[PDB]
Design a protein around this ligand. Structure first.
Ligand SMILES: NC(=O)c1ccc[n+]([C@@H]2O[C@H](COP(=O)([O-])OP(=O)(O)OC[C@H]3O[C@@H](n4cnc5c(N)ncnc54)[C@H](O)[C@@H]3O)[C@@H](O)[C@H]2O)c1
Ligand SMILES: NC(=O)c1ccc[n+]([C@@H]2O[C@H](COP(=O)([O-])OP(=O)(O)OC[C@H]3O[C@@H](n4cnc5c(N)ncnc54)[C@H](O)[C@@H]3O)[C@@H](O)[C@H]2O)c1
Ligand SMILES: NC(=O)c1ccc[n+]([C@@H]2O[C@H](COP(=O)([O-])OP(=O)(O)OC[C@H]3O[C@@H](n4cnc5c(N)ncnc54)[C@H](O)[C@@H]3O)[C@@H](O)[C@H]2O)c1
Ligand SMILES: NC(=O)c1ccc[n+]([C@@H]2O[C@H](COP(=O)([O-])OP(=O)(O)OC[C@H]3O[C@@H](n4cnc5c(N)ncnc54)[C@H](O)[C@@H]3O)[C@@H](O)[C@H]2O)c1
Lengths: 248, 248, 248, 248
């Protein structure tokens, strides 16, 4: 495929519905050699299976809240992949309490801190830890959501974390571009990984249907291939034109 | 390729350096059946050659300033392609006088009128004329430039025409999305189709080089394939991250 | 008031409901000396009567569709205001059939030409005709609408013209800054100058209410006073936060 | 003045050069009654002396890094202003080493945590602590910078925090609108509160000059007065049009 000859690390695969899962399927399909990570033991075995399917037996543990964990994982990965071509950052989180009800009432210093640390900082923490291992022409990818650009009910602090992550994409792209590395994001429309949210999106979205992990996977597979060589620091909307419409 | 089974019309191919040329090369490479148009006789024979190379002997005349010319061309095209899957709108123009020196002094009512008619209206004029001939899953594509979002010296009225064209993309996408048609644009970085402009871009661009018709072609080939099924109404920047940087 | 010493030309007063009307009162209240224009024989009386109430007796005819009408009006104005400090451009028009139903079917080459000419080109045309009459410290202001950034049902081709207009604001600001002129736009929320539109807006609007011609007028007075000396080429949203919200 | 009747809290006054300082004078000039805060023992004297010159004797300590410090300060304020009409948030900080050199190498998990906490979270933290003390018609204002939208050399992690901050502005506006509170930000151009930066800016800036704390103060006074009743969740650019220009 258009990813033949590329070595790509994929984080965040927690189930067959996970966006990261849809992305690995498509990159594999296009011939990329894959490697996966898992947040903790409770998910290992399970992530080892997905990897076997995509011709990969590279399954490493990594918690992004810890630098030591990130470095340790890239050390292992380094054993089988002294060099590689980028990674898919598909990690997101905020304390349950943070995402419901009035934003100003829900947000807490700690809530803000964790959501920004896990959802935004982990992206450059990861680039930071593997920077000398990336080949020229490598590409990094992360996932955002429209809640970064607009105020969406309940999305609350996760919206500030995503605005931060989107800016992280421009700064990472600007600093890593000179050594042949591109960095972008995909702002996905809602995907079940609410039933109302999804109903709504569907009727108001230009393409008249919510997008899928397959739709996102192909966009990610392309954004991490040399096909998108002229694109860096971009937040591509793969939400069927939802954000560009109004009052449908 | 990822365009096998798609029938795509390509306008604006005026030479081997034309963006439209770079786009046809890539769509052909990916297996799309192509068809070309030419503004006038002075370019026919020449455009008939490019077409033969890309396995196409469908070369039709079409001046977008005339509805009759657009309808007549789609009538011919209809003879060999009763249905097809979209087109690449790679047309741009403004009276020479309009693009140099102070904007407020250069712009003229006529200058404004022509630049907006040829660069922006011709895009939906074309969708309008072939709308019943598009298959489900079709995709339309046009080309814009950063001058639509920011005030660039000398670009003058062409910048208002491109802002118009970018908005045209959202409205066309919003109206045609329900019948399975997506519409997007690619805002390309500067491409020689100045020597200073290009010098500058190159040093300040994240990827440290100006983009190419090949880089744009692959992005266009992807945006017109089902790979980008979840993307509509978007202006993708294929300028190496130039617009997202500042003061490099 | 903060506009004392300021001589500003105001266009587009058609009724006490008119946005240009709320703007003229606001500016008058803050001490500006005003001059008015009226499009034709039908509006002359209404405009003369308002100019009188606002303490003005400069009531000049002007059809921005015509360069000659623009020059003649400014020659008239210059006999009483050899120099003045800017003008409000509150003009808008698209042929009746352009604004209802599917965008691509409603739009036509002529409907497009006129919407852009009247709604966008007329702004810089006026700036051209009076460029040498503006004191440094002058400010030009126009009015746009969210339809310029999102695809809004039925706004159709007016969305494209507004987009062309907002770019005009950027190019005119960049061109005229060196001589002490600022150029901005207010992107106002909908105002009854639909019943459902206004009904939808009010509940999903951050400030929980549609904006009034008093809100737009006060922001207009600000954007044309020395208070906004540091703001130029900006599109200020005065829609109660409507556009920065989503899925409310 | 247009702020008579208004009681506003101003944070971040550190010197006569301070932006919060130009803002306090401007607001004072327009008739606002002010209250001030100072971060620590080192700034208390300077702040007391300015409060005196601006006719105020409410000078309270507050370290936004601490929730308790925020509550205590508002309990102090409430004894003299049971209700007031908003506050200016002009606070910013990132550890010394964060702002120079390559972005990815300079950033660290701690430098990131602190920049976001102090520069972004503190805004809503203050809004939390005093939410019930705001009269309807209140306005909250903060200060951002273009580094939030473009990747700007050396601004590094502060760009991510500002981005998080501007989204905060949107989420706080959407949350507090229903109770009559507006929330906005001024994205100011650079001010000496570098010599080359300022040198570059001035020549490529539309208004041909860097902005002053008087320009930012007048726009601040406006954004916190009833004059801006129709503006909420907006990021107003007060940079002389710098950001809407390119390749100047
Ligand atoms: N589902 C949607 O509607 C949607 C839409 C747009 C964007 N996104 C974004 O896509 C990304 C993936 O989300 P998803 O919908 O696939 O959900 P998901 O639960 O399937 O995947 C997210 C991953 O977060 C990982 N994670 C959490 N904390 C971690 C830590 N401390 N260390 C390492 N890994 C950790 C988990 O292992 C998990 O697999 C997120 O950034 C999310 O914000 C989701
Ligand atoms: N070259 C750059 O630096 C650059 C960068 C970004 C975007 N673009 C855009 O890409 C598009 C293609 O430009 P290009 O650089 O390939 O130049 P080009 O000259 O190679 O192609 C543009 C085409 O305009 C066509 N044209 C003009 N009037 C026409 C009419 N009345 N009817 C039918 N066709 C007509 C010509 O046939 C010509 O081939 C334009 O819209 C341009 O604005 C160019
Ligand atoms: N009403 C709203 O809800 C709303 C919302 C957002 C933006 N706007 C914008 O504000 C501006 C004013 O609109 P309005 O609602 O006050 O409408 P309006 O009908 O009250 O006034 C607009 C004016 O356009 C003038 N005009 C039209 N063609 C002209 C020509 N050829 N020459 C000279 N004058 C001409 C008319 O005399 C008229 O008074 C427009 O640009 C509009 O797009 C209106
Ligand atoms: N100076 C510029 O060119 C410029 C340009 C654009 C935006 N800004 C923004 O304007 C705001 C003001 O910056 P400035 O240039 O006036 O700098 P400044 O040093 O004059 O003032 C900022 C204030 O931050 C306060 N502060 C820091 N940590 C604090 C804490 N933990 N608790 C309480 N107070 C604390 C300090 O007392 C200080 O007075 C910032 O948010 C900055 O990012 C400045």
């Amino acid at each position: 495929g258009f990813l033949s000859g590329k070595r790509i690390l994929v984080t965040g695969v927690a189930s067959k519905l996970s966006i990261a899962y849809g992305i690995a399927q498509a990159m594999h399909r296009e011939g990329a050699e894959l490697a996966f990570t898992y947040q903790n033991d409770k998910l290992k075995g399970r992530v080892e299976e997905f990897a076997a399917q995509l011709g990969s037996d590279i399954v490493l543990q990594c918690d992004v809240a810890e630098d030591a964990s990130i470095d340790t994982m890239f050390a292992e990965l380094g054993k089988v992949w002294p060099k590689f071509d980028g990674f898919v950052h598909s990690i997101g989180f905020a304390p349950g309490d943070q995402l419901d009800g009035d934003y100003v009432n829900a947000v807490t210093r700690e809530g803000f801190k964790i959501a920004h640390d896990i959802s935004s900082y982990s992206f450059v923490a990861m680039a930071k830890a593997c920077r000398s291992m990336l080949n020229p022409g490598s590409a990094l990818l992360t996932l955002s959501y429209l809640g970064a650009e607009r105020a969406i009910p309940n999305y609350n602090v996760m919206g500030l974390a995503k605005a931060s992550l989107e800016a992280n994409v421009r700064y990472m792209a600007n600093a890593m571009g000179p050594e042949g590395v591109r960095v972008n994001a995909i702002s996905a429309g809602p995907i079940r990984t609410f039933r109302k949210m999804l109903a709504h999106c569907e009727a108001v979205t230009p393409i008249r249907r919510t997008v899928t992990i397959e739709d996102v996977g192909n966009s990610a597979a392309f954004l991490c291939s040399d096909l998108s060589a002229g694109i860096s620091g971009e937040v591509v909307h793969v939400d069927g034109g939802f954000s560009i419409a109004a009052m449908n």
